[PDB]
């Protein structure tokens with residue numbers, strides 16, 4: 001996926017994040033202890049005219 | 050043994066624990082002990 005800066009907050013004890021159906025929507029890195037969000041990149045379908 | 054806590058109270062009533070507040074973990078002590086009874090320690094005169 002593609003990583004961007006996160007506008008959300010994590011509690012100190014928790015390390016992962018998800019919204020629905022085991023989709024990791026955020027994560028904190030083990031070195032900077034910074035917060036990042038994960039979203040899939042730009043997959044799609046192709047049609048021809 | 051996971052110990053949860055919340056300090057700041059709500060003065061909705063007097064001497065009663067009315068209200069709702071979630072609790073966040075503080076310490077999870079990994080000892081692996083079996084405990085069936087327990088007491089409490091106070092300050093005596």
Ligand SMILES: *[C@@H]1O[C@H](CO)[C@@H](O)[C@H](O)[C@H]1NC(C)=O
Pocket residue numbers: 030031032
């Ligand atoms: C790891 O080292 C980097 C180097 O500056 C530091 O910024 C970071 O806070 C360190 N993280 C831990 C968990 O020690």
